[PDB]
Amino acid sequence: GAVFLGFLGVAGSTMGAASMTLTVQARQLLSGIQHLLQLTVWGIKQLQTRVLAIERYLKDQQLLGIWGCSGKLICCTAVPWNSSWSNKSQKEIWDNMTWMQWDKEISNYTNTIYKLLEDSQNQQESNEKDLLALD
Amino acid sequence: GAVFLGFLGVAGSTMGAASMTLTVQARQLLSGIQHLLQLTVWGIKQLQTRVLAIERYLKDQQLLGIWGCSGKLICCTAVPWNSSWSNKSQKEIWDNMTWMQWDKEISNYTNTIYKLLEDSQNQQESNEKDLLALD
Amino acid sequence: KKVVLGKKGDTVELTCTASQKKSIQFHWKNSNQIKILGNQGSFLTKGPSKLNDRADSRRSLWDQGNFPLIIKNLKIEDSDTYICEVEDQKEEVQLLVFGLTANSDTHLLQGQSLTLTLESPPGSSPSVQCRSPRGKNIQGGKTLSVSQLELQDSGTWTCTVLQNQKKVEFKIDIVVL
Amino acid sequence: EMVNQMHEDVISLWDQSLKPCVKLTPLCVTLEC
Amino acid sequence: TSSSGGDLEITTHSFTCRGEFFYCNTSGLFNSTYMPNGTYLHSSITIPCRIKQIINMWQEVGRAMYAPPIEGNITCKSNITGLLLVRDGGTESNNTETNNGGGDMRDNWRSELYKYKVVEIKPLGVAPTACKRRV
Ligand SMILES: *[C@@H]1O[C@H](CO)[C@@H](O)[C@H](O)[C@H]1NC(C)=O
Ligand SMILES: *[C@@H]1O[C@H](CO)[C@@H](O)[C@H](O)[C@H]1NC(C)=O
Ligand SMILES: *[C@@H]1O[C@H](CO)[C@@H](O)[C@H](O)[C@H]1NC(C)=O
Ligand SMILES: *[C@@H]1O[C@H](CO)[C@@H](O)[C@H](O)[C@H]1NC(C)=O
Ligand SMILES: *[C@@H]1O[C@H](CO)[C@@H](O)[C@H](O)[C@H]1NC(C)=O
Ligand SMILES: *[C@@H]1O[C@H](CO)[C@@H](O)[C@H](O)[C@H]1NC(C)=O
Ligand SMILES: *[C@@H]1O[C@H](CO)[C@@H](O)[C@H](O)[C@H]1NC(C)=O
Ligand SMILES: *[C@@H]1O[C@H](CO)[C@@H](O)[C@H](O)[C@H]1NC(C)=O
Ligand SMILES: *[C@@H]1O[C@H](CO)[C@@H](O)[C@H](O)[C@H]1NC(C)=O
Ligand SMILES: *[C@@H]1O[C@H](CO)[C@@H](O)[C@H](O)[C@H]1NC(C)=O
Numbered sequence: 317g318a319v320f321l322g323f324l325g326v327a328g329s330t331m332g333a334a335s336m337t338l339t340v341q342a343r344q345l346l347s348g349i350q351h352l353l354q355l356t357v358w359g360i361k362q363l364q365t366r367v368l369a370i371e372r373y374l375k376d377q378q379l380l381g382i383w384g385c386s387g388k389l390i391c392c393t394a395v396p397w398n399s400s401w402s403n404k405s406q407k408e409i410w411d412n413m414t415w416m417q418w419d420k421e422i423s424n425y426t427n428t429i430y431k432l433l434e435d436s437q438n439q440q441e442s443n444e445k446d447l448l449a450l451d
Numbered sequence: 452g453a454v455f456l457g458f459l460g461v462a463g464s465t466m467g468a469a470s471m472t473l474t475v476q477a478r479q480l481l482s483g484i485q486h487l488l489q490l491t492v493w494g495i496k497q498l499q500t501r502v503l504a505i506e507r508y509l510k511d512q513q514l515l516g517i518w519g520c521s522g523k524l525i526c527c528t529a530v531p532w533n534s535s536w537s538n539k540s541q542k543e544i545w546d547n548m549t550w551m552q553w554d555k556e557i558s559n560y561t562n563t564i565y566k567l568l569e570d571s572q573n574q575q576e577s578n579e580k581d582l583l584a585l586d
Numbered sequence: 587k588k589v590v591l592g593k594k595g596d597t598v599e600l601t602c603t604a605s606q607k608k609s610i611q612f613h614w615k616n617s618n619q620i621k622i623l624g625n626q627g628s629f630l631t632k633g634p635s636k637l638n639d640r641a642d643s644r645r646s647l648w649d650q651g652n653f654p655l656i657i658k659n660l661k662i663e664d665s666d667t668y669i670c671e672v673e674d675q676k677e678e679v680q681l682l683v684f685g686l687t688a689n690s691d692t693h694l695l696q697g698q699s700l701t702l703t704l705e706s707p708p709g710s711s712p713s714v715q716c717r718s719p720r721g722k723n724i725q726g727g728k729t730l731s732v733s734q735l736e737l738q739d740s741g742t743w744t745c746t747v748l749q750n751q752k753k754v755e756f757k758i759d760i761v762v763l
Numbered sequence: 764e765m766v767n768q769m770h771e772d773v774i775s776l777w778d779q780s781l782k783p784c785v786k787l788t789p790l791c792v793t794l795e796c
Numbered sequence: 797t798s799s800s801g802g803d804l805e806i807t808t809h810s811f812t813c814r815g816e817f818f819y820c821n822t823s824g825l826f827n828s829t830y831m832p833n834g835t836y837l838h839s840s841i842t843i844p845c846r847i848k849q850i851i852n853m854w855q856e857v858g859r860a861m862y863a864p865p866i867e868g869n870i871t872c873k874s875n876i877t878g879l880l881l882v883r884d885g886g887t888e889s890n891n892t893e894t895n896n897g898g899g900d901m902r903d904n905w906r907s908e909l910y911k912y913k914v915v916e917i918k919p920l921g922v923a924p925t926a927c928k929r930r931v
Contacts (some may be wrong), residue, residue, distance in 0.1 A: 339517060339569070342514045342516075342517050343565075345510060345511070346514060346565065347562070348916055349916075356491060356492060356495065359495055363498060363502075366506070367502060370502075370505060370506065370509070373509075387513070387516070387521050387522040388516045388521055389513070389514075389516050389517075390516070452919075454917075456917065456919060457917050457919055459919075466923060511920060526927075527925055527927025527928075528927060528928075529928040529929035530928075532924055539924070540924075544923065544924065545923075550921060554918065554921060557922065560922075575929065578931065609856075609857060611900070618886060618887035618888070619885070619886055619887060620885075620887075621884070621885075621886075626898070626900050627854065627900035628852070628853060628854055628855060628856060628857050628899075629805055629806050629854070629899040629900075630803050631800075631806050631899075632800045632801050632802025632803070633800055634798035634800045634886075645789070645857060646790070646791065646857065646858070647791065648857050649789070649856065649857055650793075765909065765912055765914045766905065766906050769905055769909070770901055770902055770905065773901070773905070774855045774856075777855065778855075781815055781862075782863075783861060784861045784862060784863055785861040786859070786860050786861065787858065787859045787860070787861070788857075788858035788859070789857065789858050
């Protein structure tokens, strides 16, 4: 995906391609089985990138936290979809609109989904207490 | 464990030893309660290691993801064991074959277990939908 | 099996194969495994044998994985199986070298006789097919002789000996006066 | 093969280390005999 | 009992000083027999090993041509760690035994690395328990 990250697919490959290259990125990195006096500064600048990679990585890989699947690579949410948002089915979805040209179709619900998602997380917290109010 | 990682036991100590030093690594790091003009380059080389530590750390500490226990330090899977694989019980298991000489006994099921494990993860996904097909 | 032959005065070539083509460790060792010639990494261990004075090899070829072995100025005692054990197999050449001469040394006369002697190494069952400038196909074993030796017999004689599927040519020089 | 690695490190070291005036090294390119 | 000879570097004590080496014959220290006594004799006294210039390479087959030496006044000391030997063996022998020589570096620096065995970590480990999930 051109960088240490974006590592769950290749551009132009439509959705299903990237979605499945998830597991093969896993399975491919699972087993593991001249230098100038001022190369210093290149190494240096080389450093940041990797850190920042992990940093952002977490930074929302973290805040998949309030989204209920931090750390991992694959959510499934619990919200009712609004056909007003995309109105498409997996067939054309995964095989077409090579994502970069996919999400622009929904460039606006970008935060409405975060809305509904954290909302259902709080929904779960509410039902956990409802269920615990007796035992 | 000789490095920032491998930090859940000591070599030669058989399994039970390392398995329990897990929790005491936790409990021991919980509370927290000359320099040459070219020391630069040693610090530099010192850097990578720590990053790469976290990097690999995650990199599959991450892909404990598809294994259903990423992030953490201790899984319990959900698969039926093949006595053909080791045919041993915790008693000798944990007290003997100081792991380095333990896993070589099963140097081949290395990926069969990943097989069955991700397989049961997908098994859970399948049962979640079966169960949700009505309500 | 793959033999070689010599002429008691010649050299000979003996072959060693290698698949890595890489100059890996070979050693040349005779029947009961004395060390004769050996690649020690990038070096040749002139073994402790009868051949501490003679044997050799084209040295460049090793970085190709073809390791040779020569036996210069063969005398009938250098006649023996060898072996090359490059990586996991022990290719065996077998060298059965001889030579030959005639009885007459400098002086012959017309109507006289001459005989032959072939200095075979032990264990050989050869057959000497020998020629003449006059077409005297002396058909027989070792000791080839003829009761007729004439001025027309002048000129050397292409003598030959078959030792287990090969031969090698020979002078029998004939000079009068 | 750590030993081979040290080996090749050393061979790397020796040549800018040591300067052969005129090195007569051999070569052949495959042409069967 | 047998230093046949050949290329100087396998037999003679060949060692690097002034960048060059000291090449003598099989006359020194190479001789003694052992039935319950040695066979030699009895400060800096003598042994005649001299220098060449046109050397062979331990590295890759093929000659080399070095420089005329320095005027003089050189010295080299040492601390022998050990020795490099193979029986001058065979099947001509009757009850005397002889050892005889080394020129392959891959052991010349392996009387120092029998210890060092490089390994990855395989910090992902498998073991049995009684762990299985909800159905
Ligand atoms: C892209 O086009 C090629 C045509 O050569 C096709 O084989 C490939 O499947 C297309 N990409 C996707 C994701 O379908
Ligand atoms: C989304 O769908 C729900 C029920 O399907 C509906 O109540 C809500 O108004 C919809 N919102 C949008 C923006 O379509
Ligand atoms: C929207 O979804 C409805 C569902 O019945 C479908 O019939 C219709 O074709 C869709 N329209 C568009 C523009 O996606
Ligand atoms: C993707 O779109 C092309 C045309 O744009 C269409 O032929 C194809 O069927 C679509 N994908 C699927 C899965 O139908
Ligand atoms: C969807 O996003 C685009 C972004 O340009 C915006 O213009 C559009 O108004 C959004 N949809 C609706 C219904 O407003
Ligand atoms: C290893 O042997 C020592 C004896 O020196 C013993 O104290 C120790 O318990 C053994 N290791 C384990 C893991 O029991
Ligand atoms: C593992 O065990 C299951 C049932 O316990 C069995 O069906 C399967 O064939 C076994 N496989 C191996 C490799 O032992
Ligand atoms: C294999 O498992 C069976 C189960 O009862 C046990 O009886 C047997 O001793 C085991 N054999 C080995 C070699 O572990
Ligand atoms: C481990 O093996 C040793 C020797 O085989 C034995 O003394 C010890 O009891 C074993 N461990 C257990 C838990 O039985
Ligand atoms: C188990 O692993 C070893 C590793 O050397 C391998 O040789 C063996 O074939 C494997 N078991 C089976 C049944 O193949």
